[PDB]
Design a protein around this ligand. Sequence first.
Ligand SMILES: COc1cc(Br)ccc1CC(=O)O
Ligand SMILES: COc1cc(Br)ccc1CC(=O)O
Ligand SMILES: COc1cc(Br)ccc1CC(=O)O
Ligand SMILES: COc1cc(Br)ccc1CC(=O)O
Ligand SMILES: COc1cc(Br)ccc1CC(=O)O
Ligand SMILES: COc1cc(Br)ccc1CC(=O)O
Length: 289
Amino acid sequence: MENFQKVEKIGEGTYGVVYKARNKLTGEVVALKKIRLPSTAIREISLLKELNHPNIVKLLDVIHTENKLYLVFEFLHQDLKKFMDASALTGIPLPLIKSYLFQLLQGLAFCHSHRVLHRDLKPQNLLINTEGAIKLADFGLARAFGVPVRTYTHEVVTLWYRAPEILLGCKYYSTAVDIWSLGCIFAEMVTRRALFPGDSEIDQLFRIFRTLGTPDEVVWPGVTSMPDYKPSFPKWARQDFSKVVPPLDEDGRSLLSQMLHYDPNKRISAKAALAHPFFQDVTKPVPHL
Ligand SMILES: COc1cc(Br)ccc1CC(=O)O
Ligand SMILES: COc1cc(Br)ccc1CC(=O)O
Ligand SMILES: COc1cc(Br)ccc1CC(=O)O
Ligand SMILES: COc1cc(Br)ccc1CC(=O)O
Ligand SMILES: COc1cc(Br)ccc1CC(=O)O
Ligand SMILES: COc1cc(Br)ccc1CC(=O)O
């Protein structure tokens, strides 16, 4: 009642509960996020008030009061997950898929240029508006809170978009982790079905392996010395993307292939992806929702 009016509960997010609230001074509606519990996190998150871009959900405030931590974000009404589910009989139209991917790559390119990663992109944290924009939510929170090593949520943590280096225990998180996640989301928009819906770390890893082939030192130098690599992993051959994401055209399949290279160093960058021929005919359509 001093600062905010509660409007309604939005749900249980990756970091805790999320409410729709109304700022009493400005009259604006916001997403107010209570972090389910350091000083270090508050400094890191507070710097994210500078990481502003049209395709990043805007961080409005960081509140530390009564030994509790709250983040205030711009409000958007729908996530990509809900929109895909609502679109499932028809699919999202291709021009809108392309628009959504282009915009997300612009947001990634900006953050990556500042050496900030997301680490946990998923359809539930890609928010859309009624004119055709899409925005990345919760960008830069995972490094501040130690995600994905640390877990805050009450829900099962969704492994479906995790890059293979994370699943194999790598120490070092590069920009490539976000390109992988986005590639998985691209495939999901096209096919209307998650690409790698693993229900455990090994099921996640084996779903990747069955589609892309079991990784080896030929495609990914050093993979066999990763902390969680097992020489006893089954050896699957790679499938062609033409079987994986029909009816995507060869430009799209080439782009997707590059987003899903095993070796993070070989993964296409967001800036290079924006120049791909898949985007020659990109436009900004209006969504049907
Ligand atoms: C972040 O906001 C709160 C935190 C606590 Br504890 C109690 C009440 C509020 C709402 C307000 O201050 O209006
Ligand atoms: C004083 O508590 C809140 C304030 C605001 Br704004 C949002 C949500 C709550 C939790 C609750 O109402 O249980
Ligand atoms: C209730 O969950 C959300 C709420 C908002 Br607003 C943005 C993102 C999420 C998903 C998550 O944090 O996983
Ligand atoms: C679940 O409680 C809240 C959630 C949000 Br968002 C804002 C404020 C509160 C009150 C509290 O932290 O007691
Ligand atoms: C050419 O049709 C598609 C191709 C791809 Br890939 C995805 C979605 C559609 C539906 C449409 O855009 O109407
Ligand atoms: C989804 O519900 C939960 C899961 C776990 Br683990 C702990 C507590 C809850 C309830 C809550 O405090 O909202």
